[PDB]
């Protein structure tokens, strides 16, 4: 879902 560096 979310990229490794997301959030």
């Amino acid at each position, epitope marked *: *879902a*979310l*990229d*490794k*560096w*997301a959030s």
Partner: antibody
Framework: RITLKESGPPLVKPTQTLTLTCSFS??????????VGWIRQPPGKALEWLAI???????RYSPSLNTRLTITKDTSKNQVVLVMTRVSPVDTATYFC????????????????????????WGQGITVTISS | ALQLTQSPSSLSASVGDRITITCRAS??????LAWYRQKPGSPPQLLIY???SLESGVPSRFSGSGSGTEFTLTISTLRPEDFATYYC?????????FGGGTRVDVRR
């Protein structure tokens, strides 16, 4: 200076397995948060993302090709290998590997993640034709 | 999955023009978006990373703005080497999608 270069067979037959190697210099896959990804481009078509691997060894794959792809790294040889099984004619494309920066650090402390948002250096690309 | 739509798909222009290419995402991708220019026979080249940061060594006529679902690349003064195909790429969600590309060619 970062450079990457793809190598493997220019021709492959349907149902066969395709192994592509990305050899690079200028960075190490042991450097913090670095990534190396693979992108392909069928002739005349758009770029298509395939997979990426990071130095901490997390791996991610295109959901559409997940079952046929394996990506792996060989840190000491500065290479990243992508194995695609059961190829068919639609897999004919130019295949590129590319570098992805990890976050900027200050005294080994991550302070900027903006640089990870791009694949910043690309290899020339290797043309692969799938035909029996 | 997430959709990235570029507009226009094709665009004609002349040396010296100002052009702007836009890329819209189906869900917000924050600022995780990159622009590339790809000349025939060559690999894509990074122009703008993180939606608006100018990549090192890239000429200042290139500019990127926007965040969320709408982004734009503008080349302020088109040079001959800019006749090419441009792509945007989202890096917020896996898979890291590319837009369909926009071809910029010599107007006549």
């Amino acid at each position: 200076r970062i450079t990457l270069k793809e190598s493997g067979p220019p021709l492959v037959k349907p149902t066969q397995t395709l192994t592509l190697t990305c050899s690079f210099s200028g960075f190490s896959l042991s450097d913090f948060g670095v990534g190396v990804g693979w992108i392909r481009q069928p002739p005349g078509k758009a770029l298509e993302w395939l997979a990426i691997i990071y130095s901490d060894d997390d791996k991610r794959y295109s959901p559409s090709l997940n079952t046929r792809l394996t990506i792996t790294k060989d840190t000491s040889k500065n290479q990243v290998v992508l194995v695609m099984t059961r190829v068919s004619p639609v897999d004919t494309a130019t295949y590129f590997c590319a570098h992805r920066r990890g976050p900027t650090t200050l005294f080994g402390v991550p302070i900027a993640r903006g640089p990870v948002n791009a694949m910043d250096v690309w290899g020339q690309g290797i043309t692969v034709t799938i035909s029996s | 999955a997430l959709q990235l739509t570029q507009s226009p798909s094709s665009l004609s222009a002349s040396v010296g023009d100002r052009i702007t290419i836009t890329c819209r995402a189906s869900q917000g991708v924050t600022s995780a978006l990159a622009w590339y220019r790809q000349k025939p026979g060559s690999p894509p080249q990074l122009l703008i990373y993180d939606a608006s940061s100018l990549e090192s060594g890239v000429p200042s006529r290139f500019s990127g703005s926007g965040s969320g679902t709408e982004f734009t690349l503008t080349i302020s003064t088109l040079r001959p080497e800019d006749f090419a195909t441009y792509y945007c790429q989202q890096l917020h969600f896996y898979p890291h999608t590319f837009g369909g590309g926009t071809r910029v060619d010599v107007r006549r």
